[PDB]
Write an enzyme that holds these catalytic residues in place. Structure first.
Site, PDB file in Angstrom:
ATOM      1  N   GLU A  35     -52.661  22.598  37.163  1.00 29.05           N
ATOM      2  CA  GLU A  35     -51.302  22.219  36.825  1.00 29.05           C
ATOM      3  C   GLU A  35     -50.415  22.054  38.037  1.00 29.05           C
ATOM      4  OE1 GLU A  35     -49.989  21.322  33.604  1.00 29.05           O
ATOM      5  OE2 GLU A  35     -52.096  20.801  33.901  1.00 29.05           O
ATOM      6  N   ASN A  46     -41.759  11.612  34.477  1.00 27.11           N
ATOM      7  CA  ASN A  46     -43.019  11.035  33.993  1.00 27.11           C
ATOM      8  C   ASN A  46     -42.786   9.599  33.470  1.00 27.11           C
ATOM      9  OD1 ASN A  46     -45.038  10.759  31.503  1.00 27.11           O
ATOM     10  ND2 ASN A  46     -46.029  11.709  33.275  1.00 27.11           N
ATOM     11  N   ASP A  48     -42.613   8.604  30.818  1.00 26.68           N
ATOM     12  CA  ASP A  48     -41.816   8.887  29.653  1.00 26.68           C
ATOM     13  C   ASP A  48     -40.362   9.057  30.106  1.00 26.68           C
ATOM     14  OD1 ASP A  48     -41.739  11.037  31.157  1.00 26.68           O
ATOM     15  OD2 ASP A  48     -42.843  12.405  29.837  1.00 26.68           O
ATOM     16  N   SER A  50     -39.198  11.797  31.357  1.00 21.83           N
ATOM     17  CA  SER A  50     -38.804  13.192  31.390  1.00 21.83           C
ATOM     18  C   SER A  50     -39.276  13.742  32.717  1.00 21.83           C
ATOM     19  CB  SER A  50     -39.447  13.981  30.252  1.00 21.83           C
ATOM     20  OG  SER A  50     -40.769  14.359  30.591  1.00 21.83           O
ATOM     21  N   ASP A  52     -40.596  16.907  35.154  1.00 21.86           N
ATOM     22  CA  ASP A  52     -41.393  18.109  34.913  1.00 21.86           C
ATOM     23  C   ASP A  52     -40.791  19.221  35.760  1.00 21.86           C
ATOM     24  OD1 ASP A  52     -42.940  16.636  33.286  1.00 21.86           O
ATOM     25  OD2 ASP A  52     -44.160  15.906  34.946  1.00 21.86           O
ATOM     26  N   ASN A  59     -41.587  19.626  31.173  1.00 23.96           N
ATOM     27  CA  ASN A  59     -40.720  18.461  30.987  1.00 23.96           C
ATOM     28  C   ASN A  59     -39.299  18.695  30.451  1.00 23.96           C
ATOM     29  OD1 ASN A  59     -41.666  19.040  28.465  1.00 23.96           O
ATOM     30  ND2 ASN A  59     -42.580  17.035  28.087  1.00 23.96           N
ATOM     31  N   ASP A 101     -45.363  28.191  18.511  1.00 21.13           N
ATOM     32  CA  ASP A 101     -44.731  27.184  17.655  1.00 21.13           C
ATOM     33  C   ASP A 101     -45.823  26.519  16.788  1.00 21.13           C
ATOM     34  OD1 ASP A 101     -42.999  25.266  16.501  1.00 21.13           O
ATOM     35  OD2 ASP A 101     -42.444  24.326  18.419  1.00 21.13           O
TER      36      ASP A 101
HETATM   37  C1  LIG Z   1     -49.136  16.546  37.934  1.00 20.14           C
HETATM   38  C2  LIG Z   1     -49.429  17.626  36.920  1.00 20.14           C
HETATM   39  O1  LIG Z   1     -48.969  18.724  36.922  1.00 20.14           O
HETATM   40  N1  LIG Z   1     -50.295  17.258  35.936  1.00 20.14           N
HETATM   41  C3  LIG Z   1     -50.055  16.107  35.059  1.00 20.14           C
HETATM   42  C4  LIG Z   1     -48.670  16.100  34.413  1.00 20.14           C
HETATM   43  O2  LIG Z   1     -47.580  15.997  35.368  1.00 20.14           O
HETATM   44  C5  LIG Z   1     -48.673  14.858  33.532  1.00 20.14           C
HETATM   45  O3  LIG Z   1     -47.417  14.854  32.846  1.00 20.14           O
HETATM   46  C6  LIG Z   1     -47.093  15.478  31.543  1.00 20.14           C
HETATM   47  O4  LIG Z   1     -45.631  15.426  31.457  1.00 20.14           O
HETATM   48  C7  LIG Z   1     -45.233  15.800  30.187  1.00 20.14           C
HETATM   49  C8  LIG Z   1     -43.762  15.441  30.196  1.00 20.14           C
HETATM   50  O5  LIG Z   1     -43.409  14.724  31.343  1.00 20.14           O
HETATM   51  C9  LIG Z   1     -45.571  17.319  30.058  1.00 20.14           C
HETATM   52  O6  LIG Z   1     -45.227  17.835  28.747  1.00 20.14           O
HETATM   53  C10 LIG Z   1     -46.041  17.663  27.528  1.00 20.14           C
HETATM   54  O7  LIG Z   1     -45.504  16.516  26.780  1.00 20.14           O
HETATM   55  C11 LIG Z   1     -46.415  16.287  25.739  1.00 20.14           C
HETATM   56  C12 LIG Z   1     -46.196  14.916  25.122  1.00 20.14           C
HETATM   57  O8  LIG Z   1     -47.223  14.564  24.230  1.00 20.14           O
HETATM   58  C13 LIG Z   1     -46.230  17.451  24.758  1.00 20.14           C
HETATM   59  O9  LIG Z   1     -46.849  17.181  23.458  1.00 20.14           O
HETATM   60  C14 LIG Z   1     -46.203  17.574  22.188  1.00 20.14           C
HETATM   61  O10 LIG Z   1     -45.949  18.977  22.343  1.00 20.14           O
HETATM   62  C15 LIG Z   1     -45.106  19.314  21.333  1.00 20.14           C
HETATM   63  C16 LIG Z   1     -44.393  20.589  21.771  1.00 20.14           C
HETATM   64  O11 LIG Z   1     -43.046  20.408  22.082  1.00 20.14           O
HETATM   65  C17 LIG Z   1     -46.029  19.500  20.112  1.00 20.14           C
HETATM   66  O12 LIG Z   1     -45.180  19.528  18.907  1.00 20.14           O
HETATM   67  C18 LIG Z   1     -45.521  19.317  17.472  1.00 20.14           C
HETATM   68  O13 LIG Z   1     -44.717  18.209  17.090  1.00 20.14           O
HETATM   69  C19 LIG Z   1     -45.181  17.805  15.884  1.00 20.14           C
HETATM   70  C20 LIG Z   1     -45.074  16.313  16.088  1.00 20.14           C
HETATM   71  O14 LIG Z   1     -44.563  16.005  17.375  1.00 20.14           O
HETATM   72  C21 LIG Z   1     -44.237  18.661  14.934  1.00 20.14           C
HETATM   73  O15 LIG Z   1     -43.856  18.185  13.457  1.00 20.14           O
HETATM   74  C22 LIG Z   1     -44.727  20.171  15.071  1.00 20.14           C
HETATM   75  O16 LIG Z   1     -43.793  21.061  14.391  1.00 20.14           O
HETATM   76  C23 LIG Z   1     -44.957  20.507  16.636  1.00 20.14           C
HETATM   77  N2  LIG Z   1     -45.766  21.727  16.958  1.00 20.14           N
HETATM   78  C24 LIG Z   1     -45.601  22.458  18.153  1.00 20.14           C
HETATM   79  C25 LIG Z   1     -46.667  23.473  18.408  1.00 20.14           C
HETATM   80  O17 LIG Z   1     -44.642  22.280  18.891  1.00 20.14           O
HETATM   81  C26 LIG Z   1     -47.206  18.485  19.942  1.00 20.14           C
HETATM   82  O18 LIG Z   1     -48.458  19.226  19.983  1.00 20.14           O
HETATM   83  C27 LIG Z   1     -47.225  17.391  21.037  1.00 20.14           C
HETATM   84  N3  LIG Z   1     -47.128  16.054  20.429  1.00 20.14           N
HETATM   85  C28 LIG Z   1     -48.205  15.512  19.759  1.00 20.14           C
HETATM   86  C29 LIG Z   1     -48.904  14.395  20.507  1.00 20.14           C
HETATM   87  O19 LIG Z   1     -48.558  15.967  18.689  1.00 20.14           O
HETATM   88  C30 LIG Z   1     -46.746  18.777  25.333  1.00 20.14           C
HETATM   89  O20 LIG Z   1     -46.589  19.825  24.331  1.00 20.14           O
HETATM   90  C31 LIG Z   1     -45.940  18.961  26.658  1.00 20.14           C
HETATM   91  N4  LIG Z   1     -46.353  20.154  27.464  1.00 20.14           N
HETATM   92  C32 LIG Z   1     -45.589  21.295  27.679  1.00 20.14           C
HETATM   93  C33 LIG Z   1     -46.430  22.539  27.904  1.00 20.14           C
HETATM   94  O21 LIG Z   1     -44.364  21.248  27.681  1.00 20.14           O
HETATM   95  C34 LIG Z   1     -47.051  17.696  30.307  1.00 20.14           C
HETATM   96  O22 LIG Z   1     -47.125  19.133  30.403  1.00 20.14           O
HETATM   97  C35 LIG Z   1     -47.525  16.965  31.586  1.00 20.14           C
HETATM   98  N5  LIG Z   1     -49.000  17.038  31.805  1.00 20.14           N
HETATM   99  C36 LIG Z   1     -49.783  18.197  31.841  1.00 20.14           C
HETATM  100  C37 LIG Z   1     -51.251  17.920  32.088  1.00 20.14           C
HETATM  101  O23 LIG Z   1     -49.298  19.308  31.673  1.00 20.14           O
HETATM  102  C38 LIG Z   1     -49.856  14.756  32.553  1.00 20.14           C
HETATM  103  C39 LIG Z   1     -49.874  13.468  31.721  1.00 20.14           C
HETATM  104  O24 LIG Z   1     -50.819  13.455  30.676  1.00 20.14           O
HETATM  105  O25 LIG Z   1     -51.015  14.772  33.344  1.00 20.14           O
HETATM  106  C40 LIG Z   1     -51.106  16.084  33.968  1.00 20.14           C
HETATM  107  O26 LIG Z   1     -52.385  16.143  34.671  1.00 20.14           O
END
Ligand SMILES: CC(=O)N[C@@H]1[C@@H](O)[C@H](O[C@@H]2O[C@H](CO)[C@@H](O[C@@H]3O[C@H](CO)[C@@H](O[C@@H]4O[C@H](CO)[C@@H](O[C@@H]5O[C@H](CO)[C@@H](O)[C@H](O)[C@H]5NC(C)=O)[C@H](O)[C@H]4NC(C)=O)[C@H](O)[C@H]3NC(C)=O)[C@H](O)[C@H]2NC(C)=O)[C@@H](CO)O[C@H]1O
Length: 129
Positions: A35, A46, A48, A50, A52, A59, A101
């Site tokens: 990470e 990103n 997107d 947003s 990080d 994000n 969650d």
């Molecule tokens: C360089 C590095 O460190 N590694 C990279 C990384 O930088 C890359 O970037 C990614 O950036 C994003 C934002 O810029 C980071 O955050 C992700 O964003 C995800 C987007 O899909 C997110 O997914 C959603 O998470 C929600 C939680 O808020 C989940 O919610 C569910 O929603 C349902 C429908 O949306 C709802 O009705 C439910 O009630 C609900 N349930 C829960 C449990 O909340 C849901 O699971 C999900 N959406 C989907 C597709 O269903 C991630 O949760 C979020 N992460 C965190 C921990 O905040 C992301 O972290 C960054 N990447 C990495 C790897 O961490 C990345 C690009 O892919 O590559 C990495 O290598």
């Protein structure tokens, strides 16, 4: 800070991550070199838009307030800069709940592929604790 492998890891058992929330402490550490590669200073926005935040790579769109994020839910309700500091006394609280969650590590994308089906338990090894 620049943490080495062991010295950036024992802190979970310090913050209650060991054997916590059905996730044993160790499942967690391997993602850490996937990470930010043991750096809380690694950060990007990103495709997107947003941004990080920290080694944690969190994000600004769904979780915190950097303010350039409108419609940012910010359920955490604390300044994003509160993570990036090398001192990590408080940084884990929001990172703790994100699995409660109901998606768990589904928040964390790398861990689903770089540590899933991989032996993470091999990663947390070598350190006395
Ligand atoms: C360089 C590095 O460190 N590694 C990279 C990384 O930088 C890359 O970037 C990614 O950036 C994003 C934002 O810029 C980071 O955050 C992700 O964003 C995800 C987007 O899909 C997110 O997914 C959603 O998470 C929600 C939680 O808020 C989940 O919610 C569910 O929603 C349902 C429908 O949306 C709802 O009705 C439910 O009630 C609900 N349930 C829960 C449990 O909340 C849901 O699971 C999900 N959406 C989907 C597709 O269903 C991630 O949760 C979020 N992460 C965190 C921990 O905040 C992301 O972290 C960054 N990447 C990495 C790897 O961490 C990345 C690009 O892919 O590559 C990495 O290598």
């Amino acid at each position: 800070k620049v943490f080495g492998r062991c010295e950036l890891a024992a802190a979970m058992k310090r913050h209650g991550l060991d054997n916590y929330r059905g996730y044993s402490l160790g499942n967690w550490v391997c993602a850490a070199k996937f990470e930010s590669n043991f750096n809380t200073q690694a950060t990007n926005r990103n495709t997107d838009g947003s941004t990080d935040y920290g080694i944690l790579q969190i994000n600004s769109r769904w979780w915190c307030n950097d303010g350039r994020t409108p419609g940012s839910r910010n359920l955490c309700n604390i300044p994003c800069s509160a993570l990036l500091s090398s001192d990590i006394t408080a940084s884990v609280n929001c990172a703790k709940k994100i699995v409660s969650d109901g998606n768990g590590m589904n928040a964390w994308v790398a861990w689903r592929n770089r540590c899933k089906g991989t032996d993470v338990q091999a990663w947390i090894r070598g350190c006395r604790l």
